[PDB]
Design a protein around this ligand. Structure first.
Ligand SMILES: Nc1ncnc2c1ncn2[C@@H]1O[C@H](COP(=O)(O)OP(=O)(O)O)[C@@H](O)[C@H]1O
Ligand SMILES: NCc1ccc(-c2ccccc2O)c(Cl)c1
Ligand SMILES: NCc1ccc(-c2ccccc2O)c(Cl)c1
Ligand SMILES: [Mg+2]
Ligand SMILES: [Mg+2]
Length: 328
């Protein structure tokens, strides 16, 4: 009885054929740099987990970004550091330049390469059909890379993707929620922002994998091409599932939970209803027609699936006709 187990269909074995030192983040010894090499210039902002500053590395006069971590479990801090070090040099992965102890917070401060990012609210309004495909391809390079390195990002969304549009430079940042994929491991479902949450998280299916990032990628794509921000606009985690079911339909949702022997929360009884799966051309109108194409719709169809096992992997997504027009 209970949930039917699941494994990723790709990169299942990456972490077992690597030394324990690679994925065992708890045993990692942090090599501390010197906080005096960095001078804070301006606060970019503060979120739930960190305060971020633009800074200058006074040893080479280069612009950097300093992420001062708020106190959390020491395990969560070493996980971020180990993943960043393991992924360093990878295509479109942010470079971790240093780790210092901030004198004021008494917490680790991660120093990154600076990316001159255009805010989401501005790029969202100007990206062309061509630019969207180009940037989606750059994201897929980062995701196939971290997945092939046995890591799932788990927080893919626009504010975690830096774009320097003038230089067509993209970097996938914020590896604070990222984890090592271990076949059969039960993970915490309290990851990602509500609108980006995969069905596996919303139905409390813990044995998820890299394919969670493909759902989030699909949510970003739908919002962009259809001009509907966010695409699945739930008022809460339960309504989030209802919003998805109104597009993907209730019959495939029941096939998904029956395949994995998942039981819906009984509060879905008063709110879920019965919904047909909708054709993607329904979301097309005269204000988004220039961002949509049969290739974009077919690609979206293959990412936004309830069954995490049925979604395109990052490598398959890169082979899709949607990217044929992108100069490679
Ligand atoms: N390398 C960077 N270049 C430019 N801006 C950055 C960089 N790293 C972070 N930022 C900015 O700071 C914000 C917070 O960074 P992030 O790593 O996502 O922290 P958190 O885990 O607290 O969300 C980002 O959304 C972005 O606006
Ligand atoms: N201005 C530098 C700084 C000082 C204190 C904290 C801090 C430290 C502990 C708890 C919460 C916090 O905001 C942080 Cl993250 C940064
Ligand atoms: N933080 C800047 C940013 C990152 C990704 C995208 C993006 C790019 C391609 C497709 C969907 C997207 O949301 C945009 Cl519009 C802006
Ligand atoms: Mg972030
Ligand atoms: Mg984060």
């Amino acid at each position: 009885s209970g949930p039917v187990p699941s494994r990723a269909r790709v990169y299942t074995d990456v972490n077992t054929h690597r030394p324990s030192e690679y994925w065992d983040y708890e045993s990692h010894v942090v090599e501390w740099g010197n906080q005096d090499d960095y001078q804070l210039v301006r606060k970019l902002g503060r979120g739930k987990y960190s305060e971020v500053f633009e800074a200058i590395n006074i040893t080479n006069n280069e612009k950097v970004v300093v992420k001062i971590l708020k106190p959390v479990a020491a395990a969560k801090i070493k996980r971020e550091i180990k993943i960043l070090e393991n992924l360093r040099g990878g295509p479109n992965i942010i470079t971790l330049a240093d780790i210092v102890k901030d004198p004021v917070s008494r917490t680790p401060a991660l120093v990154f390469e600076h990316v001159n990012n255009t805010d989401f609210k501005q790029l969202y309004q100007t990206l062309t059909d061509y630019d969207i495909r180009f940037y989606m391809y750059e994201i897929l390079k980062a995701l196939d890379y971290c997945h092939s390195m046995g890591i799932m990002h788990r927080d893919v969304k626009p504010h975690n993707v830096m774009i320097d549009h003038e230089h067509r430079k993209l970097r996938l940042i914020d590896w604070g929620l990222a984890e090592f994929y271990h076949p059969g491991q039960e993970y915490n479902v309290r990851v990602a922002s509500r609108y980006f949450k995969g069905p596996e998280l919303l139905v409390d299916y813990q044995m998820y994998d890299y394919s969670l990032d493909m759902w989030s990628l699909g949510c970003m794509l739908a919002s962009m091409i259809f001009r509907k921000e966010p695409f699945f606009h739930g008022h809460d985690n339960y309504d989030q599932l209802v919003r998805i079911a109104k597009v993907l339909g209730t019959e495939d949702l029941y096939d998904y939970i029956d395949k994995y022997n998942i039981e819906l929360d009984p509060r879905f009884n008063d709110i879920l209803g019965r919904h047909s799966r909708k054709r993607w051309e329904r979301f097309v109108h005269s204000e988004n027609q220039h961002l949509v194409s049969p290739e974009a719709l077919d690609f979206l169809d293959k990412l936004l699936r309830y069954d995490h096992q049925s979604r395109l992997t990052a490598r398959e997504a890169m082979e899709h006709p949607y990217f044929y027009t992108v100069v490679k």
